[PDB]
Symmetry: D3
Subunit: 316 residues, 6 copies
Amino acid sequence: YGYAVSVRVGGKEHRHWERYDIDSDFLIPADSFDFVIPDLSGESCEVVIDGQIVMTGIIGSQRHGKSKGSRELSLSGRDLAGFLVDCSAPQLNVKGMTVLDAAKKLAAPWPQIKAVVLKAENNPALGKIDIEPGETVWQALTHIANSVGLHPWLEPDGTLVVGGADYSSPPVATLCWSRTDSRCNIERMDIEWDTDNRFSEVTFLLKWVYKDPTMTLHRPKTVVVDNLAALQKQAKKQLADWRLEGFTLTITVGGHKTRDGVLWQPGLRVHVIDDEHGIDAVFFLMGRRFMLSRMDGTQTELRLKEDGIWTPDAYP
Amino acid sequence: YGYAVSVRVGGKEHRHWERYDIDSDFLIPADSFDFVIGRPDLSGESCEVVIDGQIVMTGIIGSQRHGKSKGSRELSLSGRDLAGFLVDCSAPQLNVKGMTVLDAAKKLAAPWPQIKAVVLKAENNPALGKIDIEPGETVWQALTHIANSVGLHPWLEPDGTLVVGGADYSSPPVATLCWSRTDSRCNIERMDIEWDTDNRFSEVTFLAQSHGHDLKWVYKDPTMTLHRPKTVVVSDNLAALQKQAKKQLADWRLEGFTLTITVGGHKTRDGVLWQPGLRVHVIDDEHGIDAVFFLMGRRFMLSRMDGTQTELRLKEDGIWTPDAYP
Amino acid sequence: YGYAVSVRVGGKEHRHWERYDIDSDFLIPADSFDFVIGRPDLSGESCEVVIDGQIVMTGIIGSQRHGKSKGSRELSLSGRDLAGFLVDCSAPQLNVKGMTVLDAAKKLAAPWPQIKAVVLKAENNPALGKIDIEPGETVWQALTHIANSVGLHPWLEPDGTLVVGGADYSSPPVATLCWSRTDSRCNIERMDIEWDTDNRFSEVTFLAQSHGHDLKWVYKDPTMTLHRPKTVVVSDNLAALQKQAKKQLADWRLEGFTLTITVGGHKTRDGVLWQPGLRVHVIDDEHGIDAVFFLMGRRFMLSRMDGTQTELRLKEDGIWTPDAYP
Amino acid sequence: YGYAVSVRVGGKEHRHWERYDIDSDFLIPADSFDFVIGRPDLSGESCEVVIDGQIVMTGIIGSQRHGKSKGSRELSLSGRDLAGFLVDCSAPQLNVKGMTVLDAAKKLAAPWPQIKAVVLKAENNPALGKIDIEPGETVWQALTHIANSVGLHPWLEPDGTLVVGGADYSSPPVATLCWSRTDSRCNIERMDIEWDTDNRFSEVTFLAQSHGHDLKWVYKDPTMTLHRPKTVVVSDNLAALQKQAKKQLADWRLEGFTLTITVGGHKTRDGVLWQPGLRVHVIDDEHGIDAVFFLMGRRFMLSRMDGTQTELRLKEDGIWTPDAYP
Amino acid sequence: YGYAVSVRVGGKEHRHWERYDIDSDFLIPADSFDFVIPDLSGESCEVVIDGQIVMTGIIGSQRHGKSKGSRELSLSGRDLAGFLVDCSAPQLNVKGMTVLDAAKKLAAPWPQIKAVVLKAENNPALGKIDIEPGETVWQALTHIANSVGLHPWLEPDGTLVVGGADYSSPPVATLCWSRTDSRCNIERMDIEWDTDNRFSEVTFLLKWVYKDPTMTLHRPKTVVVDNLAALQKQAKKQLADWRLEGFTLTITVGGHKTRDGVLWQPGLRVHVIDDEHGIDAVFFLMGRRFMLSRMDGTQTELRLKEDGIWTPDAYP
Amino acid sequence: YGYAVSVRVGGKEHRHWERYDIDSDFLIPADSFDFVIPDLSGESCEVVIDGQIVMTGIIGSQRHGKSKGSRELSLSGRDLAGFLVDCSAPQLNVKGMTVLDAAKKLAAPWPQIKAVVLKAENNPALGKIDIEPGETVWQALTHIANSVGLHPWLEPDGTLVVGGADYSSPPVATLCWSRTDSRCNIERMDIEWDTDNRFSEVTFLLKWVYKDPTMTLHRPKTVVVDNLAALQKQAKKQLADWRLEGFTLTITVGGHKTRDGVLWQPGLRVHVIDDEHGIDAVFFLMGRRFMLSRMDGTQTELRLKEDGIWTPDAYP
Ligand SMILES: [Cl-]
Ligand SMILES: [Cl-]
Ligand SMILES: [Cl-]
Ligand SMILES: [Cl-]
Ligand SMILES: [Cl-]
Ligand SMILES: [Cl-]
Ligand SMILES: [Cl-]
Ligand SMILES: [Cl-]
Ligand SMILES: [Cl-]
Ligand SMILES: [Cl-]
Ligand SMILES: [Cl-]
Ligand SMILES: [Cl-]
Ligand SMILES: [Cl-]
Ligand SMILES: [Cl-]
Ligand SMILES: [Cl-]
Ligand SMILES: [Cl-]
Ligand SMILES: [Cl-]
Ligand SMILES: [Cl-]
């Protein structure tokens, strides 16, 4: 009669929690989990919710706390990017390599990562990417992927992807706000606009200048990014990433599933109607947090962005 | 985009509350209201409480507070419906026998022209028997006595009409409410159930003295193992003793169970303001409930923390004032 | 640098409180006190409450608590003024007619030599009429009856003197307090106003039976539209019926309005301890108030959160015990 | 590893509470219990409260609540011990003279076979005098009257036996509890002392009327300086008047002092469940206490914040029901 | 009947708030505001209180939040130093330039800053100041100004000043503490003494050594600051700045104006009497925060320093 | 009838507090204190509890706060390591020097530190340790000490030690948990396991490789540490330090003294029995916080580690 939130460690399954936070995000390298109810730290584990895999990772830390009136056991960790986030990238010449092959090679030391897949149309050969001493595997992978307009992330089953958004798939839920209409699902809504990365002119350095026509204020910027085609490619992606930073729509809904049974997952598009704020648009889900609390029960925070902006090269 | 809720006084709408509580109940005599805004002396003024242009209560502002400190100003208003007059003021020494129940009610409400109609909410309009009322009785007490003698009860309606009457269980439920931790179509925010065995007796011996204690009827539930006997004196034949004893047993039975549901908003899906006298179909698969309940009390609420809600005080179906509409 | 507040018991000063409440009121019989420090059995001991060497109350410690846990120890004391004896203990069956009011008060306080003077706080010292008191009456009840018969009221003064008397509205206001969100010279920290129409009646018929209900005086306010009649029996001529009915109307009128002001400190600017019986000029430009009010109750307070304050319970001027000093 | 606490109903153990309060007291008629878990209708069912397989109370579930919102479900149960029947139900008009106290108790508890034994907790089993009870008296009131006439008192024991009896001060204290901010062997978590002089009178004149107010005994404490006289009518010789007056003086004396100690757990070091009727040696060097106290009331408690504790309501030793075991 | 707190964005004026914090400070580069009650982010705006300009800036960020019981709109930003704080200083040789001219030149790209003024007696020519790659315009301006014993800040009308304190202007309010006397204005008082930058001997490096005579403890320091006159000038200013860090008097008063109608502003001197702590002195207001809260209404936090210590060269 | 918590500043003794935190730790450089009840900042001070010296330091900061209902005076500071933490290490060639002599020389500028002692069996000569510009005296001392398997800390009387743990001294208290048994002292217990510094293979760089046999997951690490004997010495110490980071047992007890009158102090071994969690072992106290609060009165937090792991060279 509730959500089956079924965690698996060492072939033991756990299904009953006082609270949790399970957070996935395209831009934050390693997705993470935290659960509150034997030393499980360092163990592999999986997170499923009503028959669908949600995260594959490793328990990083465990805490057992007690006082006279209470006793609690907590577990937290990250997905399998945790390895690539922590560990040093090798000296790798990826020039001429396929972005998928370079990603495969970077991930190779961790068999725990069992597939590496491309979520884009094509699989382009890479230029010379320098990897600096000290750089992590994730940093290296991000630079590589970003060089051809793509980005890395772990999927729920532990597959590493290098890819971008498919804006072709039709929105998979509609969410509305209403202080009247009880069909409406949205419990909380937070809208943020930020100007700190809007620039009036940006000079990228092989030189291309971008100028923002409606910007009346002076806010010049200069950026150090082989070919000029490789410049505007990478520069336009920087512009797109800054545009995305400038707006966030955070919606909290009850439960963990859409009104048709799909677990919220980054990558979905979501139609939002707020007749009161005058919103009727499609947004792109970039981050998603499954939450259970004593006070609010089960909810999902949905961190929604402007549609069509992120990784527009992946699938034009 | 939400509800327009006002306290209308002298044609003038007072709107924009930060919090309110509007409470109606068949058993509590005077329905009441309470409003606060936090960003003129109306005490003693006649008012109407209005939600989206529909009057939900007619009454009198009994009290007003203004409070100020550095950082806050709060104005509050409270009051009661027009039953407040009858609850406060004294019954005359009317003899009701056999004046119709509708005419003995009309009589008792006469001094308050502010109560502009008296209506019978019942199939039949019985000639009353002998009702002996004591002199410090309030109009309300007297009205309850009279009403209850014929298996009825008094209340005020939203527009200020006094009703003597009872429940109509022929009316189809107005809504189906359901509880679910996974079904988003289910809209119950909070469900509280209370069971109380205070007034659950093993045998109850009812006594009365005839026109001319010679009258005696005893009730037993063979499902009570515990010894808990009670004897009650009823104030003229085995028929009248049995009728009234049975009303007491039904009153006790109602006291034993309450289902309190909290919902967001103030209206059903088909636009009906929650109001006592409605029947509500409730489903809770977790608990195994699927039944119709009778709405005996309801509270319209606004808070900063929880926004707009209704508390629905629900009772077992078919039990209260069953004679009103057989 | 702040106030020295002590509970003096057996010449010994107990000082250094973390919190207290010292409450005086003309209408509540026994003024009270409550002290806590949080860093000897004095229960039943005689005490004086002293602020900056001035006694503000004379009474008896009724109760004491000591509480300890790891991290805190709290000692508390409560008590009442000397009216506590009269409130608790029984009146004799004195006949007062026409003993002077001052002599019937002296009589009733006689058993408590702890009350070391009885004073009349009134222009005239009327010979009392016939006052019929019932045997379980407390000295206080009896004293209130007697006092009220002649448009007076009893209280204890700070030094333990019993007063029968009333307000003096000839005394110039002792202070002007004002409210402002921009004027720093304005010193009111909190202003609460309450209006209540509970005891605001449309017509009131007063009845009494002569020496030898033949006495009847009815009051009406033509500004009441709502029907809210009341009849009151007063316990020997149209003059005495009218005098006492009017005192009841004034009591009701006082109940209908309270202005509660909170100020920092315990003294006016000219060094006067707030005390019931003072008149206070209040200005609130925001609200449109500029009037004099009569101080009926006051509470000296200390808390960790708010420090040193006084709550001032203010009433409409000129209404309470108007005969005491015409 | 902690206590197994259950509500046993129909052989079935309900365990796993998040919070409870189990309160027993010689002076409060019906001991009570309250349980909540927060992760079937048992109202009106017979139950036993059990700690580590030992029954601590026998009673009836009076009420049950289930509450649900998103994020919490809470089931609660309350009830009383078997004295609840006697407190609720009516005494017969038994004449007790001189039936033994044990036989007049047996009689009055007879209708509740649920009370399966009546025991006398006293040296002697006096033939009762003339006890005049009024008709709406409860079995409990009547039992208290009768019991108290012979310097005894009624209570229920954990297994459901009705006792008429008193304290045994020959029984050695069961435990020594001590308070210390530096001694870890000292186990008191919280110590609260209250002294109250409400019912401390200077002279008390006791009056009674003989078999055939001619009976009069007056008490004085020459340590009272304050005038606080009381007169009490007792309902047939200077011996019986003096016996009962003295019981009243002892009751008042007990009301004047309470020591409330809070301890972790529910058992003494030697495995005894805290229960009224035990004597407890208390040491607090800080306060200068080193004495034995009589346990009059006790509350087993569980909370999330404080875990498992017992509140021990302790009274001056040797004062309550001193005749029961001279 | 309250404070007219009148904010102006795009020629719309807003006057009614649930709360705000408006903070100005000589040492924190960009003053800031935050207000709680249409996308206003990136818009210019002004803050006035009862007819007197209080801050000129740009809305940096906006948030609209709502739940079932509540709805709130917040705006925050900084004064016009925000531009110079964010943006890269150019390669500028200021040698031989007047400090006012160098400040004018550094501010020139932002016409939004309409005047640049000197608040000192004279306007000295500067030495070679090196500006490092990456340094901001504010950092550069601070180094320049500091080189001649001065400091930069924005005034309420958006004028940039390079200057120092005028200790000649007489204290403009007296504030007292009293648990008795209700004429006394101070609601809260916080006094902080800190020793972390008191040194027993400081060697500045062209070498001058400072020695503290009452310092008994060993706490030596060495600092890397053209002329020797330029050394003791700049060294004595470092000593003065450390002395200032060692003591702060924070007073919270009700309202926003002195007992004669002047809005609290950094730069004023304030007589403080606390007969209870035994204080009777003049302090210099270095920072000022206008506050409105539900719980405490309108107040001002006044961050007061030792008189006469800061920028003693500006006006000897 | 309580703890005599007797602080001494300028020959004034203070004994009465609303709260305090007094924290000592082998790994955090400067132990610290904070007390809540005249400018005492910069003054030397001592902390004793019932006749036993507990900390020797310097008041770093003082605060006096008041509002209408309350007034409080706070003092905080650090032990005498505060000097060596703040100040620059000199250019010192410690090669051939005895570790005790090198420590003495590093501490010499602060006579406030009146003894420097070795808490190990022997006193080995040091190799070339380089001290970088900017390095503090404490950093230098730590590197020196660590180079020979030891560590620095200040003892309660202000003596500087370079040393390690004596695991020979028998446990000095037994602490138990019981929801029944009231003889049991433990009010709260927090157990933390963390895997972030467990590695599958560690290559130290003159090259030694460590391999963890039970580690199934790939987590390689490489570390830059004269002799090869000097490598495994220093490498094994790094391994031991990481092992210690992976587990902490935090126990809160009431009071400040063992059940035999010894003030809790880092360095003691403690037998812990938790029949409920199935713990029966000896742990090593690495950190200790004396606390007084209004809500919980006097307590000690005991930060306990795995026995025998830290500084195993000091006393084999
Ligand atoms: Cl990610
Ligand atoms: Cl599943
Ligand atoms: Cl990373
Ligand atoms: Cl009603
Ligand atoms: Cl009524
Ligand atoms: Cl509905
Ligand atoms: Cl009084
Ligand atoms: Cl009274
Ligand atoms: Cl004043
Ligand atoms: Cl009992
Ligand atoms: Cl009873
Ligand atoms: Cl014990
Ligand atoms: Cl600034
Ligand atoms: Cl203006
Ligand atoms: Cl900057
Ligand atoms: Cl340390
Ligand atoms: Cl000592
Ligand atoms: Cl360091």
